[PDB]
Structures are given as structure tokens and as C-alpha cells.
Amino acid sequence: IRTIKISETENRETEVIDAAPCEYVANMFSYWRATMCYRITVVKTAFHTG
Amino acid sequence: TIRVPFVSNKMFLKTAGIYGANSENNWNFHESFSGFLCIRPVTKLMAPDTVSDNVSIVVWKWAEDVVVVEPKPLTSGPTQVYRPPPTASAAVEVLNVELQ
Amino acid sequence: DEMAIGYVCGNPAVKHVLTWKTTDAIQKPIANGDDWGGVIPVGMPCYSKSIRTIKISETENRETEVIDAAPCEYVANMFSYWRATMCYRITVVKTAFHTGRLEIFFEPGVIPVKPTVNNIGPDQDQLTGAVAPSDNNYKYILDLTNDTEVTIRVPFVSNKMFLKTAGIYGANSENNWNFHESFSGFLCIRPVTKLMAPDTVSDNVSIVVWKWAEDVVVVEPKPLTSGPTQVYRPPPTASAAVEVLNVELQ
Amino acid sequence: RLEIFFEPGVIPVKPTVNNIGPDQDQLTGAVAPSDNNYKYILDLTNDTEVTIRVPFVSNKMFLKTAGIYGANSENNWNFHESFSGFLCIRPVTKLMAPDT
Amino acid sequence: KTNENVISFFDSTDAETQNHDVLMKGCGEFIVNLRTLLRTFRTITDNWILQANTKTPITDLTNTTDAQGRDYMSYLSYLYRFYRGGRRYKFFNTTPLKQSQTCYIRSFLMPRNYSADEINVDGPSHITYPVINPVHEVEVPFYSQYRKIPIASTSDKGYDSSLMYFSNTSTTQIVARAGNDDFTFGWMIGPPQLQGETRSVVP
Amino acid sequence: KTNENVISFFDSTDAETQNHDVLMKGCGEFIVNLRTLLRTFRTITDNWILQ
Amino acid sequence: ELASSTSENSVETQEITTFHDVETPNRIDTPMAQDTSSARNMDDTHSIIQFLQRPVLIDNIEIIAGTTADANKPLSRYVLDQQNSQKYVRSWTLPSTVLKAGGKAQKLANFKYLRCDVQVKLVLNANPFVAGRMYLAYSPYDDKVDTARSVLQTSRAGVTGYPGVELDFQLDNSVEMTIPYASFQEAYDLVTGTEDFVQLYLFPITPVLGPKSESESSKVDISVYMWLSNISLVIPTYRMNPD
Amino acid sequence: ELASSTSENSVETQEITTFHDVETPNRIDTPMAQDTSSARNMDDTHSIIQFLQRPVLIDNIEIIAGTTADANKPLSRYVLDQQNSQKYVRSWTLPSTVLKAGGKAQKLANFKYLRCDVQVKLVLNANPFVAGRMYLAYSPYDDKVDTARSVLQTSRAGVTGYPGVELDFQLDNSVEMTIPYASFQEAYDLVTGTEDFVQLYLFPITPVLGPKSESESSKVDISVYMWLSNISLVIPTYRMNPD
């Protein structure tokens, strides 16, 4: 939420959404349906264990 | 890479998302996902003092076998791309839904 | 297909639940309140109706006709004229201890009635075995000891290609013509043999009658009533007023 | 319409200083629902008899033959380990019968 | 006890044959499926007053006429529980036009049971000018999250599609509707009570 | 270090088949190419004043 | 009888996806009894998740010839106002009704969606001198729509038009009925979802007619059993609905 | 679309034995939707009573290089007295242990007998500088026999003789194990029956050896998952054990 000053009696809130390419397209339609894919990566070294 | 097929006891799901979602308006948010993935450590992270006590976890997103429905946004406002103002004080343009 | 006229009208529905007492006399259509019964209009449109009278002031009341139409009668209200074979399944709820022989005969033509300032009822007095001999009328005699039911199918016969669907709508002393021209006959249920029943059981027997049509054919896509089709909606209180639709255009 | 259901295991009883009887209080439709128990509902108007055969089932190769012999408050163990279950006869519909 | 039989009076004759013979002399058409009535347009309101620059979802009018039972869509809906498919509407302008104005008609999408203030004015749209085309015909596709939708259930909002109306000037037109070639009802139930004449009297 | 794999939850079923089945009961059309949206007209201004 | 133990090493990566979940380590070091045997008795049926289709007494009604309460109240031929609604002997709010009995709820615990048809059966048992009739029937979203569209707000001809089955005290000892999944919502939320769907009914076509003296009375009684068919339970969860 | 109802009559006797129970009346009068359709989505798995074989975190142990408590206590080479018993990192009283987690107990509710083998899997996760070894193993009726016959009352050579599997922090990331049904009692009483059977163990072959400074510590941790196989659930009952 980007809150800016307009006066000492109010502020202006504007929603900022960091949508991905797929989320960017899903915004043009009303309803959707698909198989969501997620690739989880764990940046580390061969010394980390978990 | 985890692939999560579509499952929502509903043919389609809303695309409202988090748009205008808050205490009084959070219904469209729920009816637009169908679930959630949770990432909880099974075994506490081990790491010698010779390295870092932290580990970054990058997660990518994208969809497959996609099928959208109605050619119109489900949001209460016209599609608008946020444009970062020159200063953190400058005001942004707000589009309405009024017609002349 | 859940919208094919033939099947919609084929949906059975109870129209009467008469009470046959061991007291009732033979050759006399079971009289009794409920509404009609001993004299079923045998028409496709609806015939039964109740009048809901509400108070508006100490100088007038508001009468609104409430018709308990069956599935077939509900459809016949969308068109002007009809034509079909009316089917009726008469059931006599009882025990194997009750014995009797009910008669059901059909009589084509006008129906002996006694019009009211706001309704129309049967003239039971004009339908007794003496003044109304059912010797030449198509009939059936259901014996309670052998059978417990009987489905009577009455083909279309009215010296008219089609019959009006007005029914009992707005029928009274001054307006009862559309009522007659919308049935073609009536089925009469008069006991042939007085009902027998020991004191070990009940002196009464409920007679359930179902209604539905087959081989149906409707004609003009418009109600024959003087008012737009409107579904009666039971108000919150027995005093609350209902909405009345007119036929005025702006 | 009488109901007859079988229930494997111990039998709800009320041991006596010299005998052993059933605990009817612990076998009512409320505390003893026979919805999942193998049963049969004999309707008096259709049938007048029914022969129920109960195969051997006791999580034990064989069962003791002690029975009720010398069974009481202090000695009621051999009684349990000698049956494997019990048949219960509870009316599903109250008995109807004219004064005649 | 038990038994039961069946009997047909008179001498039979193909009731169908006779019927068909009658419709060939007193009708000309043969109505068989009621769904066909969901294709024919019928007026629900002989006058629908609206103001200028006012996005008005037909639901404000729909909710009222759906319970009246005047048209076929409403009358027939009382015999089923579910419905499915798009809908069509036709607006016949009856508003007097002023040359000093340029009246136009605009209809958009929207979700069912949504307030004009919680939706945008984008997406597909149709527009007509009563000055040259008094009739504003439009169809609402069946965009739903379910294959079927029961009439008035829970708080299921924005599950399917609704119709939003608009006009630059205050209007008044006769509205007529009908489902598309995919609209139909389901799960037949029992019929409610019909209404008759009302006149009021003294005692 | 390295490796990486892939996993699909639930029991598969042509996601396409299902989708197509849904669009046949709740849509009627199947949008696949976005270029098609470059053919459909959309208002950019509800009023453009000019002299 | 030897090697009563295991040791080190293994392969790269692993799955062993036992139902849900996976885990990925370097293969695994594990014992098992050298070729283990049943050693026990498993030949007395097995049963399955078909548990939900087990008939269960889901209420018991007792009709008494004594016409006093609205339990004998026969279907009204008309319904002019809501204050004179139609009176039923008993009504059940399915499917939640059947999901609370027989302990079926605790069975489908940790499950998300469910789909099936409710199976019902009324077993009557009146004596030879008790006459009467009843029409079962069911409605979809009866308590989820405009009151006027309710089976309770319509004439006798309308109520009898609803999908149902007749019942005569002197002809049929029991009548069944099937309630097709009437879910517009693919599935049904076991956790959350009010699960609220339509109420089922049982209206008395005619008044329970019994012999007139007092002191003896004439009863009928009934037994209502219910179970599910065409069941469908699929996505697990840690949540369950305690409503 | 017609005959939205049923009527009288039927046949003599009846069964319709839906699972358990029967009922016997004169056949039955009953509707069904004229040839009903699925109308909904059931193609996302189905699952079955195989629920019990779902791996479940049945405890989580956390080994810490800090040799202080008896959690690091390495297997004693001798056991002269009971006061110096053998110390384990953790022990579980199967099978009741696995029947309480994952909500499996509430699953097999209303059932009488059960037979199966407990499946276990220890998933390790120590860092590259932590060395150590551990020997899993299990015993039958260890807590149901003369103390002297207990795996805790024997030398290191005896404990290592029990059916088990080794575990090295720097070789195997996870080790499994199977506990054959070890029930001398055909079956197992789910209700009544103390269900008490033998305790499973996990003894540290050697002391968790870690680098010596303080302030950093070296941990290992573990995750214990359990499930059942060769399951057998058969005779229903209204009783269930809340112990």
C-alpha cells in the first residue's frame, strides 16, 4: 500500500500489486482454471543440511 | 517443481485476488485460490560457523493447462498499470468508472 | 428432457381427499367441503379455488382468488385452448376390514352448479341417484374388498376441437360461461353400497384422487384469463395485502 | 419389527455376590447404537421366524468353555473369555396389538 | 388391499391422430417442448423508468419480475429449482428524444448480484441510438463457476454473469427477455398457487 | 547441490479434458491466443472532446 | 534366522511416495522380517470406505391415532398466509443430517470434498385396524429460496407435485427413496461450507384414521434409516467441521 | 420428466441387505431420479481405507552435540544392576502410538479387530561436521516380560543383537523399518484390550561426536514417521476405546 500525504487531515492509499506474468493475464478475465506450477529453490552451499 | 492441478469444487475460480481486499471486503479473496502451499521446516536448518546461518529460498510461479473465461476483469475498477511517480511524494492518477 | 409438455402434465397430483362415512347414503355423490369431489370437472384447466378476503376499511374488503392448480392445470393456464385425455387415479385409503363399492361415472355437458356472488359450487341436490340415474353413463364400480385403486382415463370428447382454459378464473353468478366451455363433462363418485366398517376400526375412509393428463395438445401461446399470469404469494400475516397486477400500458 | 444385532467383545454385565446379570442400562438405543452392527429386522406382519447363523469370530483360535460356572463379582474373567460376543433383541417399532 | 387396475372410457382412437387433425384445422403449430417458450420474447414491464448516467443492473428489475410470474421465464421458473444458460433482452425505447441531445444506449457485463459501484465499465459492450434503432437487443453469455445455478441461494455472488444498463439521458422503455439457445431449467418440483380476479366489495 | 526433480499432486486426469468440459458448461468459448484481443474493440475514452 | 540388522550406504535421491508425501534422501537402509507371514485370521469380511452406505436409524417417529398435536395435522388444501404454513410430521436437513449419525462424520475426518446421493427408507409398522396415508417427498434448497417457492407455502396439489412416494399403513411396510446429489457446487465442503442444503419432508396425505374409543389408542410408529451412495471423498486436510 | 411420485403394492418378503442389517417388509415402493447423472467432478483421486498407511510425523527428536542429558548417553557395554539400565534417546509403545497420530484412531472408530505391521522411517538431517552412529531396533513384549529379558537389561552386545538397523549421520539420510504383526492374539481389540504391545526403541551406538567449542553447538535432529501395512479391520461395534 502506497500511502501519500494530501493534507494533515487525510492520506491517499493506492494498492500496488507485484503480479507475475500469469497473474498479469488472469487480471483481464473474470474467472480462471489451470494447474499451478511452482519451482522452489534453496540457494545455499553443499555445507548446509536440512 | 511442484505442480498443483485445479481442484476447487468449482468449475472456475474468481480472478479478484487481493484487489481491494480488507477487513470488510475479503470474500472475493477466498473464492479466488482454492488452497495454499505451506513451507514448514521438517528438520531445523544446520550450518557451521564457517558459512552463513541463513539460506535464501527462491520460489517461481507460472501456470499450465490454462483456461480463462469472460473477457472482462473482475475488479471493481478499470485495468490500470501502476506508474512509479518521480518522487515518493508525487500523486498518482486514479481512474474511475463514470461515463459521460 | 425436463421441459417437454407431455411429461410436465404427466406429473401426478392430489386434488381431493374426501371423507366417506358409513352414514352417507348411496346414489349421492360424496358431498363434504374440501372442494368439489363427488363432481370432478374432468377438465384439464383448474376448477377449484378459494377466496382470500382481507380488510381495507369498515366499508370494503378485498377479495383475491386463490386457485390450487395441479401441474397440468398450471400449464393449461399459459394457453387459450386445450385438448387431451384426462387421467385420474382414485385411491381409497382404508384397511382390509372395510367393505364397499364406489361408483364413478362420467357425464358430458354442463355441470349442475350453484353460482355464488363470488364463486361456483356443485348442486348436489341435482345429482342424486333419483334425479341423476347413472345407468347409461360410462362407469366403474370399485369394490373395496377386491381392489383399492383404479385409474380412469377419459379421452377428449366435447363436440369441440378445443376447450377453453378459463376454468374457474373470475367465475361467479354473472360470469360463469367460460367455466362451462372449459371442461366437457364431470366425473361423479357415488357409493353403490353403503360403507361397512366394524367398531374395531374407523367409521371413515379417506379417498385420495390424483390428476394429470396425457396426449396433451395446447393451442394459442397466451392465457385466456382477463388478467396477466400471476403466482399467488402467501403474505406474512393473514391481514397483509397482496399485489394486484393490471392490464394497463403506459 | 424386532431388531437383532450382534456385538463382539465383552458383554455389559452387573456381577453379583453369587451370579452375573446383564446391564440393560448400558444397552439402550442411545448408549448402544446398532447402526454399524450386523443385524436383521424381523417384521411380524411378513415373517414369523428367522434363523441367524453367527460364524466363529473371537480374535482367538478357540474360546474357553467355563461359561457362567462359578462366575461372580470376584470371578468373572472366564465368563468373558468364553463367548466372543452377544446378540441383542431390541424392538425397532413398538408392538401393536388391538384390545381384541 | 393392493391390486389396482386401469380403465379407458369410450372407444379409443389415436388421441394423437385426432389431436394432430385438430391442430391442422384450428392451430397450424404444435407446441411440445416448454423450453421453446424460453426462446420467445415476452414483456415483463410495459415501462421501466431510469435516470441519465445511471449504471443500473437489470437485477434491480429482474428480482421483481422473477417473482411476479408474468412472463414465461418467471412463470415457468416456479416449476423447477435450477436454471442454466445465457439470457437475452430487448429494450424498446419510449422516451421522447430532444434534438438538443444525442441519446445512446450502453449495456455491459458484470457479475450477478453486484452493485454498479463495485465493478468496472470495461469488457464487452453494445451500443445503439434510439433515434435510428429504438430496439436495443443484447445477449448475456453463460459465464459461470458452476454448471448450474439454483434460484436465490446462500451468498453466492459473482458466480455467473449479469447485465448492466446505461444511458446518457433519462430513459423509459419496454423490456422483454428470453434465454439464449442454451437456457433451460432443471429438477422439476411442485407448482405453487395461481391468482385470480380482485375487485373488492362491501360485506 | 544440483539434482532437482518434479512432482504432481493428486491423481492426474487430462487437465485439458476437464477444462474443455468446464468451458462447455460455463463458458461456450475458448480463448487461446491473446492476439485475438487485438481484434476485439474496446473503449479507451468514454468522451473525447474536440473543437 | 541371521543378519538381524542392517548397515550403511545407499543410492542417490529417493521417492517411496507412500500415498501422499514424498521425502528425498539417499535411498534407505531398512530391515523387514525375512519374508514375513500373515500368521493371523483375516477372512471374516474386510469392508471399505463404503461405511457411509450403512443404513442407520436417523430418527424414529411415533404416530398416534390421537389427533391432537400437529403431528396428525393433514395436508391443508390451501395456504393463504404464512401463519398457516403446511405441517409435517418431521423434516431433516440433509445431507448433514445423515453425516452426524452412525458416526459417519468422524469417519470422513480430514477430508475436504464429498459427493453422493442420500438413500432413505421408511419402515412402517401399524396394526390391522389403523388406516391412513402419507406422502414422502423431498425438495432442493427449499430453505434456501424465496419462501413462496417452498413446498410448505403451496397448496395440497402443489406439495403432492414434488418428487416423492406414497405410504399406506395397510399396503406397504416400508418405502425407500433416493436423493440425487443436488449440489450445484461441484463437491461439498466438509470443513467450512455450511454444508447447508435442502430439508427433506414427510407430509400426511390424510389424517391417521383410527377406531374412536379412548383408553386403548392406536399407534403406528416408523423407523427412518439413511445412508449414502455414489460417494466421493478426495482431498485431505488437517481441518474438520465441528458444527 | 412425469410420474413424479410412487404408489402402493409390492412383493412378499424382502432383503435389500445394504452392507450390514437386513429388514424384511413387502418389497418396497420407492422413487429414484429417472436415470440420474453424475453431474459433478470426481476425478481427483479417490483414496480408500488405506488411510492408515499414510506416513505421519509421530514425534520429532532433536539431538544436540552438547553431551549433557542422557540423550547423548551412549550404549553401555554392561548392565550390572537395574539402576544402571540402558538409556535410549526415545521409545514408542506401538501400535497404539501410531493409532493416535494422524487421527487414525477416529478413522477406525466402531471397529473391533485389527491386524497389520507398523512401518517406520527415520529421516536424519545433520551437518557435514557432525559424526555419530545409532542403532534402531525393536522388541516384542519388551515391557511385557521378565525384566531380565528386556533389551534395556542386557549388554551392548545383546542390544545390538536385536532386530534393528544402523544409522550414521554421514552416510544415510534416512532409514526405514518394519514391525511384522507380532500379535499372538489373532487380531487386536480396538475397544477394550489394552492394546498394549511392545515398546520400540532407539539406542545411540556411539556418542554424538561434534566439534568442541561452545557458543555454536552442533545439532542433528530427526523426524519419525509411521504408518501401517497389511491392515485388517473387520467386525463393527458401537464401542470405541477412549484410552
Side-chain angles (χ1 to χ4, degrees):
Chain A
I1 302 175
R2 196 225 187 190
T3 312
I4 61 168
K5 306 177 180 182
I6 303 172
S7 60
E8 289 90 54
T9 181
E10 82 162 6
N11 295 308
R12 178 170 304 185
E13 300 191 304
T14 297
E15 297 184 305
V16 176
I17 319 174
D18 65 342
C22 70
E23 302 176 299
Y24 186 102
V25 176
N27 184 60
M28 306 178 91
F29 310 97
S30 302
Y31 316 92
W32 65 277
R33 185 200 176 75
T35 301
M36 299 316 290
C37 311
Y38 296 106
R39 179 157 70 64
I40 322 165
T41 304
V42 190
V43 194
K44 66 164 196 310
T45 68
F47 293 115
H48 294 76
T49 66
Chain B
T1 304
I2 299 177
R3 308 177 63 272
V4 187
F6 188 83
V7 299
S8 175
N9 94 283
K10 299 187 196 66
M11 292 198 113
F12 298 118
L13 278 180
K14 298 193 183 70
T15 63
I18 196 77
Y19 185 102
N22 52 50
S23 304
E24 310 299 305
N25 185 46
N26 68 312
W27 157 281
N28 292 250
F29 176 74
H30 295 299
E31 316 293 299
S32 304
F33 289 115
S34 90
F36 70 82
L37 276 170
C38 192
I39 303 179
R40 307 183 307 182
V42 188
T43 303
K44 213 160 182 173
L45 176 63
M46 308 280 73
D49 61 308
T50 52
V51 291
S52 174
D53 62 308
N54 290 179
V55 290
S56 299
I57 294 176
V58 187
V59 183
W60 298 69
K61 177 170 185 172
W62 77 89
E64 308 181 306
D65 318 302
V66 189
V67 290
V68 298
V69 188
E70 163 171 47
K72 166 183 185 170
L74 191 70
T75 60
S76 55
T79 54
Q80 172 171 48
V81 172
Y82 180 72
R83 317 179 61 196
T87 307
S89 56
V92 292
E93 172 183 56
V94 184
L95 304 178
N96 60 81
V97 296
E98 301 174 0
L99 317 174
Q100 294 178 333
Chain C
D1 191 298
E2 269 182 304
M3 291 202 77
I5 294 171
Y7 166 111
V8 185
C9 296
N11 196 316
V14 181
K15 286 296 294 182
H16 327 84
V17 180
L18 318 176
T19 298
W20 185 22
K21 314 181 188 185
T22 60
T23 280
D24 303 305
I26 61 166
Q27 296 207 301
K28 184 177 178 180
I30 315 188
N32 274 342
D34 284 72
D35 208 348
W36 300 84
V39 180
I40 305 101
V42 183
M44 197 178 127
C46 199
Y47 53 86
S48 55
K49 68 169 184 185
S50 185
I51 302 175
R52 196 225 187 190
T53 312
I54 61 168
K55 306 177 180 182
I56 302 172
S57 60
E58 289 90 54
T59 181
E60 82 162 6
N61 295 308
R62 178 170 304 185
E63 300 191 304
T64 297
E65 297 184 305
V66 176
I67 319 174
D68 65 342
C72 70
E73 302 176 299
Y74 186 102
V75 176
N77 184 60
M78 306 178 91
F79 310 97
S80 302
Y81 316 92
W82 65 277
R83 185 200 176 75
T85 301
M86 299 316 290
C87 311
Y88 296 106
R89 179 157 70 64
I90 322 165
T91 304
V92 190
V93 194
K94 66 164 196 310
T95 68
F97 293 115
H98 294 76
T99 66
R101 299 186 57 81
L102 212 53
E103 172 195 62
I104 308 83
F105 72 87
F106 175 69
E107 166 60 46
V110 185
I111 309 173
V113 299
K114 286 205 155 102
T116 306
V117 66
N118 50 43
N119 207 308
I120 292 178
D123 198 321
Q124 306 128 299
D125 302 306
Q126 309 261 295
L127 295 174
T128 63
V131 59
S134 61
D135 302 303
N136 298 172
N137 298 57
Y138 271 110
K139 57 183 175 301
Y140 175 76
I141 304 181
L142 181 72
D143 196 313
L144 281 56
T145 36
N146 298 301
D147 304 281
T148 301
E149 232 175 60
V150 51
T151 304
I152 299 177
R153 308 177 63 272
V154 187
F156 188 83
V157 299
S158 175
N159 94 283
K160 299 187 196 66
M161 292 198 113
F162 298 118
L163 278 180
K164 298 193 183 70
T165 63
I168 196 77
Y169 185 102
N172 52 50
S173 304
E174 310 299 305
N175 185 46
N176 68 312
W177 157 281
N178 292 250
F179 176 74
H180 295 299
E181 316 293 299
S182 304
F183 289 115
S184 90
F186 70 82
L187 276 170
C188 192
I189 303 179
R190 307 183 307 182
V192 188
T193 303
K194 213 160 182 173
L195 176 63
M196 308 280 73
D199 61 308
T200 52
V201 291
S202 174
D203 62 309
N204 290 179
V205 290
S206 299
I207 294 176
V208 187
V209 183
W210 298 69
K211 177 170 185 172
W212 77 89
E214 308 181 306
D215 318 302
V216 189
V217 290
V218 298
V219 188
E220 163 171 47
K222 166 183 185 170
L224 191 70
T225 60
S226 55
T229 54
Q230 172 171 48
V231 172
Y232 180 72
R233 317 179 61 196
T237 307
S239 56
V242 292
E243 172 183 56
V244 184
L245 304 178
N246 60 81
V247 296
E248 301 174 0
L249 317 174
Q250 294 178 333
Chain D
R1 299 186 57 81
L2 212 53
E3 172 195 62
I4 308 83
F5 72 87
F6 175 69
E7 166 60 46
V10 185
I11 309 173
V13 299
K14 286 205 155 102
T16 306
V17 66
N18 50 43
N19 207 308
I20 292 178
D23 198 321
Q24 306 128 299
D25 302 306
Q26 309 261 295
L27 295 174
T28 63
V31 59
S34 61
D35 302 303
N36 298 172
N37 298 57
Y38 271 110
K39 57 183 175 301
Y40 175 76
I41 304 181
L42 181 72
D43 196 313
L44 281 56
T45 36
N46 298 301
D47 304 281
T48 301
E49 232 175 60
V50 51
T51 304
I52 299 177
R53 308 177 63 272
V54 187
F56 188 83
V57 299
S58 175
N59 94 283
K60 299 187 196 66
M61 292 198 113
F62 298 118
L63 278 180
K64 298 193 183 70
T65 63
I68 196 77
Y69 185 102
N72 52 50
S73 304
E74 310 299 305
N75 185 46
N76 68 312
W77 157 281
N78 292 250
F79 176 74
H80 295 299
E81 316 293 299
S82 304
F83 289 115
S84 90
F86 70 82
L87 276 170
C88 192
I89 303 179
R90 307 183 307 182
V92 188
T93 303
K94 213 160 182 173
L95 176 63
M96 308 280 73
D99 61 308
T100 52
Chain E
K1 203 186 188 303
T2 187
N3 201 310
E4 311 184 332
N5 299 151
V6 179
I7 186 174
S8 304
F9 290 152
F10 320 124
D11 284 7
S12 288
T13 276
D14 305 328
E16 311 151 303
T17 294
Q18 274 186 295
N19 293 188
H20 179 274
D21 296 336
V22 192
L23 267 66
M24 280 297 266
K25 305 180 180 304
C27 190
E29 67 198 10
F30 183 35
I31 307 174
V32 181
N33 201 298
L34 293 176
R35 183 170 305 101
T36 64
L37 298 186
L38 300 178
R39 300 291 147 64
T40 60
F41 285 71
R42 286 289 183 290
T43 59
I44 54 180
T45 178
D46 293 294
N47 202 60
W48 187 42
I49 310 174
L50 292 181
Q51 290 176 295
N53 297 54
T54 305
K55 308 185 297 176
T56 305
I58 38 71
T59 38
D60 307 332
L61 171 65
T62 259
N63 294 311
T64 301
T65 56
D66 275 321
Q68 301 192 307
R70 183 186 174 184
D71 70 344
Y72 297 138
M73 279 192 73
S74 173
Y75 190 69
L76 293 171
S77 70
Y78 274 108
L79 295 176
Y80 303 97
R81 196 64 74 187
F82 298 101
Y83 80 73
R84 171 264 193 183
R87 303 142 174 282
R88 294 170 178 172
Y89 302 88
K90 298 194 189 311
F91 308 80
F92 302 74
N93 181 56
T94 66
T95 313
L97 310 169
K98 305 181 183 60
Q99 190 181 307
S100 54
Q101 289 186 307
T102 301
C103 182
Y104 66 75
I105 311 299
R106 288 280 289 294
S107 55
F108 310 92
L109 322 311
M110 191 177 272
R112 280 288 277 185
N113 295 308
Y114 254 57
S115 56
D117 60 70
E118 54 189 47
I119 189 67
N120 58 68
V121 291
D122 293 299
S125 173
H126 182 209
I127 173 176
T128 65
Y129 296 68
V131 66
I132 53 177
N133 177 42
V135 191
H136 180 282
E137 298 160 282
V138 64
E139 189 187 313
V140 179
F142 188 50
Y143 296 119
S144 166
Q145 291 180 295
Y146 300 110
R147 55 190 63 188
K148 65 177 176 188
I149 288 122
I151 301 174
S153 94
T154 193
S155 75
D156 186 1
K157 94 183 300 181
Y159 60 93
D160 65 320
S161 51
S162 67
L163 177 79
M164 178 177 62
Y165 200 67
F166 184 79
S167 185
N168 74 315
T169 63
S170 194
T171 56
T172 168
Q173 310 181 315
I174 307 174
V175 191
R177 60 171 184 174
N180 65 312
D181 209 47
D182 288 303
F183 188 70
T184 183
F185 295 124
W187 215 301
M188 179 184 279
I189 51 178
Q193 308 172 297
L194 296 170
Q195 193 172 311
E197 292 189 311
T198 303
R199 296 173 290 184
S200 70
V201 74
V202 185
Chain F
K1 203 186 188 303
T2 187
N3 201 310
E4 311 184 332
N5 299 151
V6 179
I7 186 174
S8 304
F9 290 152
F10 320 124
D11 284 7
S12 288
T13 276
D14 305 328
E16 311 151 303
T17 294
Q18 274 185 295
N19 293 188
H20 179 274
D21 296 336
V22 192
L23 267 66
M24 280 297 266
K25 305 180 180 304
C27 190
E29 67 198 10
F30 183 35
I31 307 174
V32 181
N33 201 298
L34 293 176
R35 183 170 305 101
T36 64
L37 298 186
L38 300 178
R39 300 291 147 64
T40 60
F41 285 71
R42 286 289 183 290
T43 59
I44 54 180
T45 178
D46 293 294
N47 202 60
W48 187 42
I49 310 174
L50 292 181
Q51 290 176 295
Chain G
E1 211 221 326
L2 51 84
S4 201
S5 54
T6 319
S7 186
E8 322 167 319
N9 321 307
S10 39
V11 197
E12 307 169 298
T13 78
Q14 172 204 288
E15 306 178 304
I16 309 182
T17 307
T18 306
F19 301 89
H20 311 188
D21 80 14
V22 177
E23 288 139 70
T24 59
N26 298 304
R27 209 67 187 296
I28 35 75
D29 298 333
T30 169
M32 308 287 304
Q34 271 197 302
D35 301 303
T36 197
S37 185
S38 147
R40 305 285 115 56
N41 300 304
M42 178 47 165
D43 46 307
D44 318 297
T45 316
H46 312 301
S47 282
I48 324 177
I49 308 296
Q50 214 78 355
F51 179 95
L52 294 151
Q53 332 196 313
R54 297 181 184 178
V56 306
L57 197 292
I58 197 113
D59 205 299
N60 194 283
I61 312 175
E62 179 184 301
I63 304 301
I64 300 178
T67 71
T68 307
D70 290 324
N72 197 302
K73 183 163 170 132
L75 277 175
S76 293
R77 188 198 181 75
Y78 288 111
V79 181
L80 286 62
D81 56 70
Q82 308 193 190
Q83 301 180 301
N84 287 304
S85 299
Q86 212 64 279
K87 303 266 191 313
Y88 50 98
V89 173
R90 200 66 54 69
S91 65
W92 302 271
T93 171
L94 304 173
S96 60
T97 294
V98 63
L99 295 166
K100 282 214 286 287
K104 305 184 186 303
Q106 302 91 297
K107 219 65 177 181
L108 45 74
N110 292 298
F111 269 112
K112 190 62 178 176
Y113 305 120
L114 168 67
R115 282 190 304 281
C116 59
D117 324 300
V118 183
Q119 221 61 51
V120 198
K121 187 191 184 192
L122 293 192
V123 182
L124 196 64
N125 182 64
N127 62 77
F129 305 84
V130 181
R133 182 163 302 230
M134 292 190 98
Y135 186 64
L136 194 54
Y138 68 75
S139 181
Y141 306 151
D142 203 60
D143 58 306
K144 300 290 191 58
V145 294
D146 181 56
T147 306
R149 297 179 180 278
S150 177
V151 63
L152 286 170
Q153 307 297 303
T154 179
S155 65
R156 183 176 58 192
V159 180
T160 181
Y162 278 70
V165 50
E166 282 183 295
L167 176 63
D168 192 288
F169 310 149
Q170 224 71 337
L171 295 174
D172 56 356
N173 274 216
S174 62
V175 303
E176 294 180 293
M177 183 171 89
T178 306
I179 304 157
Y181 192 50
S183 192
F184 67 79
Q185 44 169 127
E186 329 293 71
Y188 159 96
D189 213 355
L190 295 170
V191 192
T192 277
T194 20
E195 311 189 358
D196 313 324
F197 271 83
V198 61
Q199 321 295 273
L200 166 48
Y201 295 99
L202 166 59
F203 300 106
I205 302 179
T206 67
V208 181
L209 291 170
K212 260 152 201 177
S213 48
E214 287 102 350
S215 305
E216 287 301 280
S217 283
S218 289
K219 216 182 78 275
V220 169
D221 211 322
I222 305 175
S223 291
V224 192
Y225 293 105
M226 284 182 215
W227 64 91
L228 315 173
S229 55
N230 260 56
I231 317 173
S232 298
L233 220 48
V234 286
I235 317 293
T237 54
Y238 51 79
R239 278 176 293 193
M240 39 197 85
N241 190 65
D243 292 48
Chain H
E1 211 221 326
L2 51 84
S4 201
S5 54
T6 319
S7 186
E8 322 167 319
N9 321 307
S10 39
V11 197
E12 307 169 298
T13 78
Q14 172 204 288
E15 306 178 304
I16 309 182
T17 307
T18 306
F19 301 89
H20 311 188
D21 80 14
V22 177
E23 288 139 70
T24 59
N26 298 304
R27 209 67 187 296
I28 35 75
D29 298 333
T30 169
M32 308 287 304
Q34 271 197 302
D35 301 303
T36 197
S37 185
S38 147
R40 305 285 115 56
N41 300 305
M42 178 47 165
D43 46 307
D44 318 297
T45 316
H46 312 301
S47 282
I48 324 177
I49 308 296
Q50 214 79 355
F51 179 95
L52 294 151
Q53 332 196 313
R54 297 182 184 178
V56 306
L57 197 292
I58 197 113
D59 205 299
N60 194 283
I61 312 175
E62 179 184 301
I63 304 301
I64 300 178
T67 71
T68 307
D70 290 324
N72 197 302
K73 183 163 170 132
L75 277 175
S76 293
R77 188 198 181 75
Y78 288 111
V79 181
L80 286 62
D81 56 70
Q82 308 193 190
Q83 301 180 301
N84 287 304
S85 299
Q86 212 64 279
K87 303 266 191 313
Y88 50 98
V89 173
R90 200 66 54 69
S91 65
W92 302 271
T93 171
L94 304 173
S96 60
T97 294
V98 63
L99 295 166
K100 282 214 286 287
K104 305 184 186 303
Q106 302 91 297
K107 219 65 177 181
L108 45 74
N110 292 298
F111 269 112
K112 190 62 178 176
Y113 305 120
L114 168 67
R115 282 190 304 281
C116 59
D117 324 300
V118 183
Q119 221 61 51
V120 198
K121 187 191 184 192
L122 293 192
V123 182
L124 196 65
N125 182 64
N127 62 77
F129 305 84
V130 181
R133 182 163 302 230
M134 292 190 98
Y135 186 64
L136 194 54
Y138 68 75
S139 181
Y141 306 151
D142 203 60
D143 58 306
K144 300 290 191 58
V145 294
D146 181 56
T147 306
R149 297 179 180 278
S150 177
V151 63
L152 286 170
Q153 307 297 303
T154 179
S155 66
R156 183 175 58 192
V159 180
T160 181
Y162 278 70
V165 50
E166 282 183 295
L167 176 63
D168 192 288
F169 310 149
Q170 224 71 337
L171 295 174
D172 56 356
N173 274 216
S174 62
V175 303
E176 294 180 293
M177 183 171 89
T178 306
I179 304 157
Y181 192 50
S183 192
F184 67 79
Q185 44 169 127
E186 329 292 71
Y188 159 96
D189 213 355
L190 295 170
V191 192
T192 277
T194 20
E195 311 189 358
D196 313 324
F197 271 83
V198 61
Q199 321 295 273
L200 166 48
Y201 295 99
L202 166 59
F203 300 106
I205 302 179
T206 67
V208 181
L209 291 170
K212 260 152 201 177
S213 48
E214 287 102 350
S215 305
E216 287 301 280
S217 283
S218 289
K219 216 182 78 275
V220 169
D221 211 322
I222 305 175
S223 291
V224 192
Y225 293 105
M226 284 182 215
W227 64 91
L228 315 173
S229 55
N230 260 56
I231 317 173
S232 298
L233 220 48
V234 286
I235 317 293
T237 54
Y238 51 79
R239 278 176 293 193
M240 39 197 85
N241 190 65
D243 292 48

